[PDB]
Amino acid sequence: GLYVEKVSGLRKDFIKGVDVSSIIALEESGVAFYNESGKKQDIFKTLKEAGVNYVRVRIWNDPYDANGNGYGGGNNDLEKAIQIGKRATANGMKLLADFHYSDFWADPAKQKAPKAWANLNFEDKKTALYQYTKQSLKAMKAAGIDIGMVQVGNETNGGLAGETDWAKMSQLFNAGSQAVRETDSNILVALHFTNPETSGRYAWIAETLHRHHVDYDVFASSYYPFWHGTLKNLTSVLTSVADTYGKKVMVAETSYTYTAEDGDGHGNTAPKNGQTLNNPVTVQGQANAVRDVIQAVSDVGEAGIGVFYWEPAWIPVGPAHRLEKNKALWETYGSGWATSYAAEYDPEDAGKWFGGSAVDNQALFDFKGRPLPSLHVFQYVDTGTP
Numbered sequence: 001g002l003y004v005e006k007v008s009g010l011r012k013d014f015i016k017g018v019d020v021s022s023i024i025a026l027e028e029s030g031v032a033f034y035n036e037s038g039k040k041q042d043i044f045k046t047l048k049e050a051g052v053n054y055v056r057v058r059i060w061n062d063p064y065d066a067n068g069n070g071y072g073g074g075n076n077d078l079e080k081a082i083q084i085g086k087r088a089t090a091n092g093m094k095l096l097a098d099f100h101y102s103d104f105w106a107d108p109a110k111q112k113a114p115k116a117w118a119n120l121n122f123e124d125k126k127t128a129l130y131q132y133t134k135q136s137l138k139a140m141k142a143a144g145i146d147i148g149m150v151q152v153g154n155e156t157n158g159g160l161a162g163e164t165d166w167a168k169m170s171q172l173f174n175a176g177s178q179a180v181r182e183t184d185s186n187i188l189v190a191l192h193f194t195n196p197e198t199s200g201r202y203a204w205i206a207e208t209l210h211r212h213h214v215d216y217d218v219f220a221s222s223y224y225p226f227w228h229g230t231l232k233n234l235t236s237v238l239t240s241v242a243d244t245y246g247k248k249v250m251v252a253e254t255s256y257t258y259t260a261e262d263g264d265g266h267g268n269t270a271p272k273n274g275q276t277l278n279n280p281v282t283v284q285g286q287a288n289a290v291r292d293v294i295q296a297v298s299d300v301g302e303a304g305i306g307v308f309y310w311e312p313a314w315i316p317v318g319p320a321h322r323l324e325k326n327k328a329l330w331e332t333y334g335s336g337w338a339t340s341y342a343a344e345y346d347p348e349d350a351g352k353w354f355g356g357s358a359v360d361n362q363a364l365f366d367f368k369g370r371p372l373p374s375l376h377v378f379q380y381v382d383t384g385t386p
């Protein structure tokens, strides 16, 4: 049924990743996943058979309040990162450790210092960032996890760990990079930014990183077709960075809607009025979208190393009509994007919009944990659909 046009020029070792950070909180909430045959199966095995070769996991320093109540969003700390890493490694997939260097969501608007670093002068915070990265990585190595890449920050367009001055941000980038370098010289160091469609943005950031001697290997970008411009532009801005600074480039996050329906009762991020939707909101449209960004990154040439799909399995803990019972699960296991307990850390955003999954309709599995046909885009990009 599904159609996937072969990606021309796709390298054989192209990174095909997925970020399934919410998996632990979901399994604790009772969510189960299946394979093609329809029998319960570890999602990591299913991802592996679908052609995925990399797993990305977000890591928050201390995503809990004083009493130990999870902030939600998967309650992703180092402990869960290790659980995920071991399963990724056990299923022959490399790991991408994504340090937010914050106790909660880090993005263009939010780059809050971890609670533990709130009262530290810059120098001590830098030491703390370095130390944290160093210890976290060692713990993962001790667990036998195969770490292929580390992200020093997440969508750090305007800040990092409470800092907004680029001179200080670069020192933090370097502090983190340091720890990676000291851990394993083979691990790729990536910096992650977003809004590639902004005129001159990526060019300015790359040049600034250069002027501040920031030591990194991959210039990563998020790419959500809804707001981030054309694929042509994406290729253009990433190619300029690659050519100009000799860096590898990749898409650290991307996704698309396979349905307009909200499966758990918590309003979804997409689709919405105003957003750009070049592909139909169907399983086929979702597949075209993924295949296209893979093509766009591949078009960069030798520098385009891969694409990570963001949260392809953040499915509902229950039906939309069971909203109130769902909240119980979200609140208890943090299997939603945020819990009310996060209000102390982020009162402005999480504080009033906390709840369930905002991306259940952009998963590569249906609302019941069955893999959608679009899951096989990872395989068909190499050959195309017969």
Ligand SMILES: OC[C@H]1O[C@@H](O[C@@H]2[C@H](O)[C@@H](O)[C@H](O)O[C@@H]2CO)[C@H](O)[C@@H](O)[C@H]1O
Binding pocket: 105, 106, 107, 267, 269, 337, 349, 353, 354, 355, 358, 359
């Ligand atoms: O109720 C939905 C909720 O989503 C938030 O987005 C969070 C997070 O803050 C982002 O950084 C991340 O990219 O996506 C998750 C949800 O998938 C958003 O910030 C809130 O305003 C709400 O839209």
Ligand SMILES: [Ca+2]
Binding pocket: 262, 263, 264, 265, 266, 267, 268, 356, 357, 358, 359, 360
């Ligand atoms: Ca939802």
